[PDB]
Write an enzyme that holds these catalytic residues in place. Sequence first.
Site, PDB file in Angstrom:
ATOM      1  N   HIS A  72      26.723  49.132   7.519  1.00  8.54           N
ATOM      2  CA  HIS A  72      26.558  47.692   7.724  1.00  8.54           C
ATOM      3  C   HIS A  72      25.775  47.128   6.535  1.00  8.54           C
ATOM      4  O   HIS A  72      24.986  46.214   6.704  1.00  8.54           O
ATOM      5  CB  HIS A  72      25.768  47.401   8.998  1.00  8.54           C
ATOM      6  N   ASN A 145      27.163  44.668  18.297  1.00 10.96           N
ATOM      7  CA  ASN A 145      28.327  44.529  17.460  1.00 10.96           C
ATOM      8  C   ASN A 145      29.197  43.428  18.066  1.00 10.96           C
ATOM      9  O   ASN A 145      28.775  42.758  19.020  1.00 10.96           O
ATOM     10  CB  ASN A 145      29.117  45.810  17.388  1.00 10.96           C
TER      11      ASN A 145
END
EC number: 1.11.1.6
Lengths: 499, 499, 499, 499
Positions: A72, A145
């Site tokens: 990420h 998420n």
Amino acid sequence: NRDPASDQMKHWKEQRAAQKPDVLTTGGGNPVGDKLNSLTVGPRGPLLVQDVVFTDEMAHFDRERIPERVVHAKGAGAFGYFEVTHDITRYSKAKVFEHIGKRTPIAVRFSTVAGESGSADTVRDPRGFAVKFYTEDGNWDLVGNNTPIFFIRDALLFPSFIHSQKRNPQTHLKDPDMVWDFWSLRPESLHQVSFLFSDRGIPDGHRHMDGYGSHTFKLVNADGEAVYCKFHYKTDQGIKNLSVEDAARLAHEDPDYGLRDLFNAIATGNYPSWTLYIQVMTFSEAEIFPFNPFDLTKVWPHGDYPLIPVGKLVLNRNPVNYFAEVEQLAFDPSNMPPGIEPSPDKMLQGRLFAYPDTHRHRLGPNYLQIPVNCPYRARVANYQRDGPMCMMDNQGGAPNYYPNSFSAPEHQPSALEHRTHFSGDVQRFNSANDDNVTQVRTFYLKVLNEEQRKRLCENIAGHLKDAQLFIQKKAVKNFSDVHPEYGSRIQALLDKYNE
Amino acid sequence: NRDPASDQMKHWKEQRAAQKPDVLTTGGGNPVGDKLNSLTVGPRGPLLVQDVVFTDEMAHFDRERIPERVVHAKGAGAFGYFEVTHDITRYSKAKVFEHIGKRTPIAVRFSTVAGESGSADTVRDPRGFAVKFYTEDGNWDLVGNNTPIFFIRDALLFPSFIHSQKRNPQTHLKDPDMVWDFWSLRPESLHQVSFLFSDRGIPDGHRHMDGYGSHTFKLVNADGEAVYCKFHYKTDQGIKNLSVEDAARLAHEDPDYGLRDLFNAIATGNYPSWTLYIQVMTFSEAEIFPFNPFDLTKVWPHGDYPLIPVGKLVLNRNPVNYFAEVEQLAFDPSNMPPGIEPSPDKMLQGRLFAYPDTHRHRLGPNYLQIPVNCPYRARVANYQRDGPMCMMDNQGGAPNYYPNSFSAPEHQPSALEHRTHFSGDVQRFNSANDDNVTQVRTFYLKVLNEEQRKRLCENIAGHLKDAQLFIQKKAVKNFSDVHPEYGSRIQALLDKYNE
Amino acid sequence: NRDPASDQMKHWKEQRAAQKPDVLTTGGGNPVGDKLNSLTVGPRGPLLVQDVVFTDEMAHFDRERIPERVVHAKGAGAFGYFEVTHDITRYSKAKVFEHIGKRTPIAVRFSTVAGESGSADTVRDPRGFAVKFYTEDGNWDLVGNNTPIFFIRDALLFPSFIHSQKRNPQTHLKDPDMVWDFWSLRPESLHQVSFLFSDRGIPDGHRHMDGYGSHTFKLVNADGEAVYCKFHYKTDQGIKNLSVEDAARLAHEDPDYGLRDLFNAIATGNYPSWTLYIQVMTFSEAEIFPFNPFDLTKVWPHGDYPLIPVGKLVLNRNPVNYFAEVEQLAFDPSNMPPGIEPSPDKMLQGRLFAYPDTHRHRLGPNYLQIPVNCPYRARVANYQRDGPMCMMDNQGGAPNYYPNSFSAPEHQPSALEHRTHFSGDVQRFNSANDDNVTQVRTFYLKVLNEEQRKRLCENIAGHLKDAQLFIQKKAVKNFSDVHPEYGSRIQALLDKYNE
Amino acid sequence: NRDPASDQMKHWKEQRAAQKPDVLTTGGGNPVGDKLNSLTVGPRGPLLVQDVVFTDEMAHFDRERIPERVVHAKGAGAFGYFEVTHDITRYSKAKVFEHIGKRTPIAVRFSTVAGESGSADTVRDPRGFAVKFYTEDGNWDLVGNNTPIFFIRDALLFPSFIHSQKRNPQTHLKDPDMVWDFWSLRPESLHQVSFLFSDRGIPDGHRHMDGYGSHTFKLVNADGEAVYCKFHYKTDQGIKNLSVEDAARLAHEDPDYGLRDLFNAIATGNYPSWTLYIQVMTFSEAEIFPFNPFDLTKVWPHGDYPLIPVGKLVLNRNPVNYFAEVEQLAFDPSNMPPGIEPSPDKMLQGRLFAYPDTHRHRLGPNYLQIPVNCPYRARVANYQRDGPMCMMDNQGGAPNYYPNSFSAPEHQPSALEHRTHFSGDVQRFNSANDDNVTQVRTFYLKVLNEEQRKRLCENIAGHLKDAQLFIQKKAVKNFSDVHPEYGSRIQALLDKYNE
Ligand code: HEM
């Protein structure tokens, strides 16, 4: 003129005004009479060690980079708030749900997963939606998420997974054989793989997607009664996903699409928002639940588990300095105030360890001392000291040992954990076959309609097709187990691709 | 009822009126219900990764230590201020000397040299007397020793020298063979070796010793006229040393004798002080000096260049948290504000580089950001950004390149370094023979009295004794060259120790 | 079967036919029983800190990342050899030119400049071409780019330059205003700014571009006779570059197109190579040279300073582990062995400091001990000791001080640098006005042709169009200063851009 | 000549004789012409950045120090082997114990506890005895001590315990108010506190004390049967302790008394050795046993649980370089080969994390890659990659995700840990009451004779005599709770000191 983002410097200079330019100082504060020419012996002679303006400046430029997040790495952040619109207190006693109206400042960072610092936003990949609540009981980090599920259920396969999702150890290129040989060996991924190769694999910006906590959590009320839950924060901007060509274009036309979209939305006052719900479930039910309740590869159907509204998530402040405020932001799943506790989720369990661990390496042992990370709405009192780059006073000269007899920080019988019971041989239980088809099957036929199914398979086919025949077989085979049609359909396309 | 120091926690719990608890919290800020019994499965079962309370604290615990100063590891610190009592503006335009009365706050650190963090204060070694002047032009670090001279005159031999003064690469024990084989081959040390093994070799507390910038510096008035100088800050508590005997006793009776003294002194309101002077030497004179005015192994006879008073140094507050405020400090010789500059003193030239270098390593790139080191009485503004553990707001969203057309920080041409003229080739010029005896002799038979003259020869022989024979001779040879009655005295003394 | 890069894992498994798989172990070597399922207290219970297989692996995964290069982040590397084909022993006594046929191992890394690690390979940007020669006299790093000149001529502007060439401190996007505001104000860039926007801005892979030292260096022969020089290594594969069209397509189709290209060429035996030439300017000519001979924004016309063959650079070996052998790779312009030295080039000067500096940060204090960085073809003997992550034997128990009477390493008087003479005042001599148009004009007129001038001004306008009007004004102006026609074509073509 | 340690350099020269010394070079292997005189423009001129010889050496010197162990910083080390003299094959299936006469390489570091790197060796403080076994099933680190028990039985108390033993948060001096405050409020320490203040508080070197695995462990044979044991390594040179004054003076006389003592023993041929024994207890017995069998402040009596002989520990080799070999040494209790496993001990369990964790801090992510820590008699192969200062080839081009279909490292079902069933609520079970006197009473009376007993009290009072009366009282109270005369005796002494 142009967008608010592109007009960054301008607006800054105007907000400045007649104000005279601050004096250009050295890192040490000493003024610099000339920072454009190097101290040299002669107009064509050597540079002198004596020029400390250079070495001071330069030396800092040499250390400007810190390691990017291991996953990420690409993302953008904003600052806003969380407002309570309901009384959920009958489940959790988190002082962040104390009462409707109670607002709690929040920080958020959206991101992709695989790509490194310089990659494109508009690519197919899950999306990071981490939320940091600066509560009065410390910080609550809801590291979610845009999907409610994941590819695996045993933390032990995470490093391996991420590897298969990044560059080959020798060529440094993206490897379809790594990606697929892996997924093919771990069907438990099928669920999220599906959700991924679907229209949700590339959302048009961050403001147009949902946020999920995925993991099953735990809430504790005033009486000390506990329950398992699921956090859901649906977007108030409506679900909007991009197309393969539109993203593929935006990949080169504007690799920072999400970043710019987000900055501008807030910069024009068009603040994005999200509603937050939950999904309460009794241990008795969790007892009955047809699947492992803490299995990350599954969802709690709405039918049996309605979503209760909690409050609202508003983002209305853009970062001033991206590095100091976004890049350094660090969300630790283990940060849950009294009222919110983890669950026996294998995946989650591992995370409790990973975030602060890596943070200690990406940012430093004292990362919590970074402004954006500091729980400024709570009083940090404990017996920890020193460590590199120690800001503040290091709790001055208060007693560092516990217990003590000199009036220093104390316990909190009220802030004790909730005690649950567990039985069974303490061993390594093979969670490999907890059903990697059911929910994927329903998804494929019920939630998806024929055209979406058409896309799903082409999306998969266009990537899978690059892996080796054998992997493909293993891969297709898995899809059939979810449904004969899923398999053959994709299979069909592949043979085509293999032209 | 003991001394102020011993009654630390005491006085702390007291001044705590009258107010509870802060609540024991984790780093995140979440309150800790119970932090005395690890969360375990069963009363005799294993540990849960889920005990983040534990993990969180242990983790921090595992990282409290940071590399100790390469040199000068052991020491004590204190804060106070400096004030003008003499107008020397006709010498330096530095804001710290502005007008009489001008009070500039300061931070000071005393220390040894060779010993490690565990070593004791009361032993034969020079002393670290460094002053940090927090001014309006930035921080001015006066990194000085208890002596106006040093053992060497070319930075290229300092590491080698500092090595010789420490442990054997293999045994990890102090090695006399190392010390003296190095000192012997480099007679330039003679002068300082002598000042070392003289009564001054071991002061009594940091309060009864003198301070010196040692090196030759440069002053420049608001008129641009420059003149070489030498700082001097003599103690007002009178010079007081400790017998070889006492030192050793204290050495183990109270290894931290230097700390408590300095501490209590201030605790019991008995604040220490020194009188700052300066030796002024025009360039003209410098061109005439019988010696290299930039040789660190030389002094400026007070008779030819007298001391002009300039100010007072008062340490009236003790650190509240040692680590954060003393161990974490950072003194950078390169930190000189307008009106003060270095000289071609080869050693100084080396310190211009090494200090910030190491600081970046010992503390980290953004170490000037540490409170104690941050120049809080100056507006630090420039084009430096990011770096690990970046604190502050990282100068916000201001223009980051120079030059720019957006009102970012400009340069102050009023602080431009003084323009000198140097002619000659660039080469490695041998200073090894720049007279290493003259000033030494005039220190032996002139500064010292027969009484303390013998003490010297004794002190030296006691150590030199442990060195190999070939080492002992060369050593004497040098002393012999300073004065035959010097080497012979020692030699004689040796042969006796030599059985 | 596809390209060699794709089958990386195939030929691997294939590589060890025979051979049985190794045992999965922890970091310590402890054999692993089960690496797929964590050790929980019950099939649906928490995770035990007692699970070391997990923690070991996870804690490591969590620290895989190190800071990327502050500039030239996204690159590709290879290994091969350098062979001497001509005797230039009259100019330099460097052991690497010691004699025809002599081969020296070398390591190479190609790169872009501004993009971060995720960035696409085929974008307009200078290109790095770093060569590390593992010679007898230690390593010799020639850190060149794909252009012989640069944008600035004083290191103090470099940090600024780069900052502008990157993301906005606030939005984290690429800011054209920043880019052109900087260039518009620093006209010394015109030269490079032009080359950059010419077809040469986006080379077709690494194999199709020249390599240059850019800086003027000093060569020294056996008689201590010195001369200045310029290093050039022209591709033998022919100059080839991508069109803005293909280049933009490849950007999303194959962000790692450069990597994949260099790998395949080698993997299939089609080894790339360059012929290294050098120009030789004598100290005399350097004096009468029409421009400053150490000004990075200039060039020695082939006309008056003909290129001279030296030998060949050949890359015939792909890396086995990218991270270890390429990423960790580091080059220091300061690494120059006897017979090869720098010039007073202000830019080269700062570089002597900055590379070893950053490496000490990105890689760490002992980064020279990393395999790819160690000068394994020489014997490192010195008085350096310790530092974190210290491998080898730390020079064992050898004497750690210089000088010493114990046979430790000695200096070599024949490696003493060539001594030159400089005279003048030691001050910040302004060079912002050393003719920033002559050579630029020759480029726009004699080196290019209409077809090209059309693409360049089209390429400049494409980007520049996004900068505030006042900025463009400033830029066109500077272009006109090189040639009226120049500013016009851009201006006109610009006016077209502004609707 | 003198001892082997003193003649270290002397010998290095001799043996290294008949060989021209190596050429002095830079970190990059470039020979330096002159390393004694810096590079300046003119004899009395400034220093040039050009001088990279200088910067190179200096930059590395500025980084020699790494953080010292948070505990047990002051220590000595050596290497040897282990010899199995007996067959406990029926207990452990651990290859280390495979056969009789089986030699296995070992490493050892003895140390004090609270004192830093510069502290003195001979003081009342426990002793560290860490044995690194480089076995075929990876390294086994037996992180023992010179005692079989410890001050506490819960991890959470440790960081707090260690603080009370170290310097004060503000005054930075050793503080008896903390020492005793902690010990007072924590009466479980009574056992080790008596042992500490006993004659065994200051061993005459490292060769005259024993070794203890301290914690309880688990052994597993080829048939999966497990048993709990205790490790003992008795000194062959016999138990010899230092007097309270002998040690107290040797302190300032020879602070490295332990270091020298050990180096010389080995150096002359007099290799020290220890005999390894194991106490064995079955789960059945572990049931009947009458305090917690895992309590650290409790010991198994040879009476009901006899000492079985296992093998020999011999140290016949000194370090060649202390930093690289002893300073960088890292022992992880978590390193346990197949046949050895932890035990429910809260203390131990907690140690399973701290060690690798802190190592990744003090040494770096790849600390196991440092020679002495590397499991070289084993074959490390896994899926861990990269990390800073990545030595080796990083496992080259091997597949990096598990599971995979390319023949990468496979697991060993043989190494599957022993499964123990556990039942009981999951919570923080209070262990502050598990008998903090019984065993202790059997010492003061049975194990201890009148003589030692006399000093034990004297030793305690002598120290505790500096704490607030209100603290002393508590202390005595717990001692008397051990036995009337114990406290009474102490208390008596206390008064005389109270003046
Ligand atoms: C004169 C100003 C220059 C300074 C002060 C300077 C400084 C730097 C610094 C600090 C690094 C960083 C990366 C790292 O090792 O991790 C770097 C990398 C790089 N520079 Fe620049 N540089 C300069 C000019 C240039 C020029 C004009 C070219 C060529 C001669 C160039 C080619 C490179 C390359 C190829 C890299 C990355 C390479 C690798 O490690 O493989 N630089 N430079």
